[PDB]
């Protein structure tokens, strides 16, 4: 498939709140900017003295990939995303057991 290399940052926030994030490695996934024939809308805080926008998208990645929740991913374009929640549809087909081979990750744009 086409895919896209990303840079994962895995770490655990300690009791005091210090983010200890370091380059865990790489992962290949396909970005989806909408659930269908439309695109998600960028949002703004309206109380921030800046021009930062918020976007929530999806990342279709192969099942069993080295990506987890709270794992920041940076594309070659420079955009950075935060993986929110666990993987979705990381299961076989209930009727048969067929493995579609891909699981969708919800990613929130953080830049």
């Amino acid at each position: 498939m086409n895919d896209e290399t990303l840079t994962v940052y895995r770490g655990a926030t300690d009791n005091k709140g210090n983010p200890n994030k370091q380059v865990h490695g790489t992962v290949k996934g396909v970005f989806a900017w909408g659930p269908g024939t439309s695109t998600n809308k960028f949002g703004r805080d309206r109380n921030f003295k800046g021009e930062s926008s918020s976007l929530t998208a999806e990342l279709y990645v192969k099942r069993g990939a080295d990506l987890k929740a709270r794992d920041r991913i940076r594309r070659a374009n420079g955009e950075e995303y935060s993986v929110v929640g666990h993987a979705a549809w990381d299961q076989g087909h209930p009727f048969d057991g067929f493995d579609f081979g891909y699981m969708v990750f919800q990613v929130e744009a953080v830049n």
Partner: protein
């Protein structure tokens, strides 16, 4: 005694059958081999040794179809994922694969059944009442 080894099937499917998935794959291979032996009419004594290449290809394709789609679905949907398959073969082999298997039959598949009218036949009749007169040689 399958017509293709499990290693060839693993290479074709790019997987490694383990634990119970190996016995199921071996049984599927044996089933497809039996079907191929019946259809082609050639009972290969040494199943993995002298089996032809195209027969191995047909057996491997049929085994992969049976393992990946045993219940013969046309569509599958799980959330945003979807897949639509073609019409499955009537039995195990598509008509092209059946033609490949049937290439060992002679006369282009033409078979003839000899009929009879139920009469036995006595060609020696008429010659039975024969008496030998002469020298005798």
């Amino acid at each position: 005694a399958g017509l293709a080894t499990i290693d060839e099937l693993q290479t074709l499917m790019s997987t490694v059958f383990e634990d119970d998935a190996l016995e199921q794959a071996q049984l599927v291979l044996d089933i497809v081999s039996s079907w191929a032996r019946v259809v082609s009419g050639q009972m290969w004594p040494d199943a993995p040794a002298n089996v032809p290449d195209d027969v191995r290809a047909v057996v491997l394709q049929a085994s992969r179809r049976e393992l990946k789609n045993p219940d013969r679905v046309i569509s599958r949907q799980m959330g945003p994922f979807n897949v639509q398959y073609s019409q499955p073969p009537d039995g195990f082999f598509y008509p092209a694969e059946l033609a490949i298997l049937k290439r060992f039959k002679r006369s282009g598949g033409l078979m003839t059944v000899s009929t009879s009218r139920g009469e036995e036949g006595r060609p020696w009749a008429g010659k039975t009442a024969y008496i030998r007169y002469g020298d005798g040689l």
